[PDB]
Design a protein around this ligand. Structure first.
Ligand SMILES: CCNC(=O)c1cc2c(-c3ccc(Cl)cc3Cl)nc(N)nc2s1
Length: 208
């Protein structure tokens, strides 16, 4: 039903660093997630030029941002390529076992956290604002799975019993209690407009 996995030691230490380093510019997390999405839509757009048959589970290639004050969550939803269970398990828990060592040296040599996307591990910035992250993903190959983690060394994968969802990936941030500014419409618009104004796909910010 629920499988529990250990972060590979580097990823866990990176996560630790991200959660523990005092660092005020937290808002860069959104750009990292919006940018993961765009890649994933690129990558599905790519494969449907040799099989316009993969858009059968979707076609509309977009990114939604969904704030919810009462659950204190901000969700970044994309209809991109999605991940299989092994994608999910490898490229969240291992996979850039590499891009992570690079980053953590880079951090000496006055690199600062805001340049995390350059090493392919931007996703982990979500931990600047969230006590818990849930990733709901559905790939053309496979079932629909829920990945989950509040850090602390491990994560879980279970098959998703929730809203079936076409194809793509939903990242749900359960916000830290003092980062509820990222739930707010003007706060979000300012950040999108500042860091992601030229993304190739529509980004719809929902209202509550
Ligand atoms: C099967 C090929 N797809 C992938 O490898 C993907 C990884 C991601 C990711 C992703 C990438 C890196 C990390 Cl550390 C975490 C995630 Cl959720 N996000 C999104 N929104 N879509 C995809 S598709």
């Amino acid at each position: 039903e629920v499988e529990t996995f250990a972060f590979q030691a580097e990823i866990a230490q990176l996560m630790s660093l991200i959660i523990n380093t005092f660092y005020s510019n937290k808002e860069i997390f959104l750009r990292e997630l919006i940018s993961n999405s765009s890649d994933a839509l690129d990558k599905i757009r790519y494969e449907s030029l040799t099989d316009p048959s993969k858009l059968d589970s979707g076609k509309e290639l977009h990114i939604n941002l969904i704030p919810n004050k009462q659950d204190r969550t901000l969700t970044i939803v994309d209809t991109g390529i999605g991940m299989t269970k092994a994608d999910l398990i490898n490229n969240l828990g291992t996979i850039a076992k590499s891009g992570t060592k690079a980053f953590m040296e880079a951090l000496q040599a006055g690199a600062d956290i805001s340049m995390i996307g350059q090493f392919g591990v931007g996703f982990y910035s979500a931990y600047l604002v969230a006590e818990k992250v849930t990733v709901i993903t559905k790939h053309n190959d496979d079932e629909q799975y829920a990945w989950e983690s509040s850090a602390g060394g491990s994560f879980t994968v279970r098959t998703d019993t929730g809203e079936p969802m076409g194809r793509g990936t939903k990242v749900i941030l359960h916000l830290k209690e003092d980062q509820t500014e990222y739930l707010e419409e003007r706060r979000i618009k300012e950040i999108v407009k500042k860091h992601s104004q030229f993304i190739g796909y529509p980004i719809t910010l929902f209202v509550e």
